[PDB]
Amino acid sequence: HHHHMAEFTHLVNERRSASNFLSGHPITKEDLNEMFELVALAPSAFNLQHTKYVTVLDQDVKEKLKQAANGQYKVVSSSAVLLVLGDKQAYQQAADIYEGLKVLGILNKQEYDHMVQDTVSFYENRGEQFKRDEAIRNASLSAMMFMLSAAAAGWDTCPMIGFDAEAVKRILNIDDQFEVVMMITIGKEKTESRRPRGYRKPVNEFVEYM
Amino acid sequence: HMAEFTHLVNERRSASNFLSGHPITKEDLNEMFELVALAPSAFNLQHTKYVTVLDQDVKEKLKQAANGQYKVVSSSAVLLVLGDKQAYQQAADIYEGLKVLGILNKQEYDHMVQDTVSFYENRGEQFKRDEAIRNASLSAMMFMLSAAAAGWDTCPMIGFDAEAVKRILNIDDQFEVVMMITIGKEKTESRRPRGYRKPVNEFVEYM
Ligand SMILES: Cc1cc2nc3c(=O)[nH]c(=O)nc-3n(C[C@H](O)[C@H](O)[C@H](O)COP(=O)(O)O)c2cc1C
Ligand SMILES: Cc1cc2nc3c(=O)[nH]c(=O)nc-3n(C[C@H](O)[C@H](O)[C@H](O)COP(=O)(O)O)c2cc1C
Ligand code: NI
């Protein structure tokens, strides 16, 4: 129970949003799949698991994403570029996600139908804006987990919103039901060349106790 | 760090209940928030604010706004995670040290401020709100992992009436109420298995 805070504190202190990446650091599907096993364990509303990742390793495709990413060269120099997607229709998979509860005899048919109905109606009652909010919220929780996993694995990342979402969707053939919530580059940054961390507001300027 | 973080992640479970007799202090929370401060945020604008409720009557008010959920009152504290829809307005203040300490000249500083401000202004109100949710949600995940690392359990929650919460806590309409997070110590023997998880090859595609 005893040393988890100090380890985590070091991980968090060492994580810097990359401004550059270095060549000669290829990343493999195996490297990434280890990070994604941790991402799978992120919390998500109603366990709907809203988040999808399109992970681009192909250098020609990365070159082609540069214009879409507001000209940011780090898309090219990165080892991989991830598009973090949120399903605006995530709630439609409630019936499938919850089905094992029925098969394992944890819920009976009525209870399972009720649970699916609670989740679906929560979303449908609130409407389209809420569905999109949920896409952004749940994918962003997931993205933070991705970045800390990457850091733990010894990789650098830069989260990015400086891109044309529509262009990215056309280039990568992403369906309409997915919001492009963020882009994350991953790779190895030269540490000697890093600027110091940007100014942070003190805790007493962003937390109110009541 | 991978073995330790893997352990932390694997352990972390959204709490269904909280035990009595585990008060949390400002000192405890401030330790967590120091890590939260180091989360990334777009343009380093630091969009997120936390309203941290220890007062038991306010928790009762919040419970009424959250479908009567008992964990609101049995929690050691209830946090409201806010995102500032007007965060971009503080660019000039946040970047000011770069100029004053001579890292940037005035032209470069003005250019930096204008780049951030115009990015938000040119996109518009829906974007500002999207940014409030996105950056606050990144922050919330950091908060939950920080709490885990400190030995606390949390439950993220969206099952509440946001307008009722803003009335209870006197929250300006400039802030989006992004999430509620309860914190405390869970009865760990009282724990259902982790809800089914999609395999990685069902949520990741490579190109
Ligand atoms: C949602 C979001 C969007 C971002 N977009 C970009 C971007 O498009 N390009 C970029 O270079 N950095 C981007 N960043 C990185 C921020 O500038 C960075 O997190 C901030 O300056 C703090 O740096 P640090 O994370 O190293 O402390 C983004 C960060 C966030 C979380
Ligand atoms: C944004 C979002 C909203 C949530 N809202 C609630 C809620 O209002 N009430 C609740 O009991 N749990 C809530 N949760 C918890 C989820 O049901 C939980 O994360 C999921 O079932 C998986 O459990 P696990 O995180 O322990 O693996 C929420 C989770 C997410 C991230
Ligand atoms: Ni542990």
UniProtKB/Swiss-Prot annotation, chain A:
Cofactors, names only: FMN
One GO MF term attached to the UniProt entry: oxidoreductase activity
Binding site for FMN: 15-17, 72-74, 161-162, 197, 200
UniProt keyword list: Aromatic hydrocarbons catabolism, Cytoplasm, Detoxification, Flavoprotein, FMN, NAD, NADP, Oxidoreductase
Transmembrane segments: none
Entries under Gene3D superfamilies matching the protein: NADH Oxidase
Source species, domain of life: Bacteria
Major subcellular site: cytoplasm
E.C. numbers: 1.-.-.-
GO cellular component terms given for this protein: cytoplasm
SUPFAM superfamilies given in the database record: FMN-dependent nitroreductase-like
Regulation: induction: Repressed by MhqR. Strongly induced by stress due to exposure to 2-methylhydroquinone (2-MHQ) and less strongly induced after diamide or catechol stress. Not induced by oxidative stress due to hydrogen peroxide or methylglyoxal.
Subcellular location: Cytoplasm
Family affiliation: Belongs to the nitroreductase family.
Subunit composition and interactions: Homodimer.
Biological role: Putative nitroreductase that may contribute to the degradation of aromatic compounds.
The protein's name: Putative NAD(P)H nitroreductase MhqN
